[PDB]
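Thread: Modeling a multi-component assembly for a lab meeting

Hi all, long-time lurker, first post. My supervisor asked me to bring a structural picture of a complex we are working on to next week's group meeting, and I have zero experience with this. I have the sequence lines for every component (129 residues in total). Could someone generate the structure of the whole assembly? Inputs are pasted exactly as I received them:
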Amino acid sequence: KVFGRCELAAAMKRHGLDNYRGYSLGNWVCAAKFESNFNTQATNRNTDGSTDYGILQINSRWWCNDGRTPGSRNLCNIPCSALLSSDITASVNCAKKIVSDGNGMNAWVAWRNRCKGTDVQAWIRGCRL
Ligand SMILES: [Cl-]
Ligand SMILES: [Cl-]
Ligand SMILES: [Cl-]
Ligand SMILES: [Cl-]
Ligand SMILES: [Cl-]
Ligand code: NA
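Re: Modeling a multi-component assembly
Sure thing. I ran the full set together rather than chain by chain. Output:
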């Protein structure tokens, strides 16, 4: 599923991401835009052999199991394919664990490089929430 901007904002808000660990909704929408272009089915392979999955491009080295990343962990205890569902619940739940591990949203390179320090509120402007 490819989400609309306000559609994804509303879905993230219902799943408790607005101000989760101090990160306003706009941060999460911005990160999803630049990580996946709002596409739940996005995948990208990394040079170390791990793969990033879903709307927030969660990585198989640490967070999910895809059965092909040797010596990896599965900290969200889910198959990576679950992160590609049109229902974003698994992605959101796993992201909550990632953002809580100490480095905040800096875990997401695109957020650090393209959202951090910008007017992220702009990403939810005009939305009915
Ligand atoms: Cl915001
Ligand atoms: Cl694996
Ligand atoms: Cl393969
Ligand atoms: Cl959803
Ligand atoms: Cl933080
Ligand atoms: Na893994």
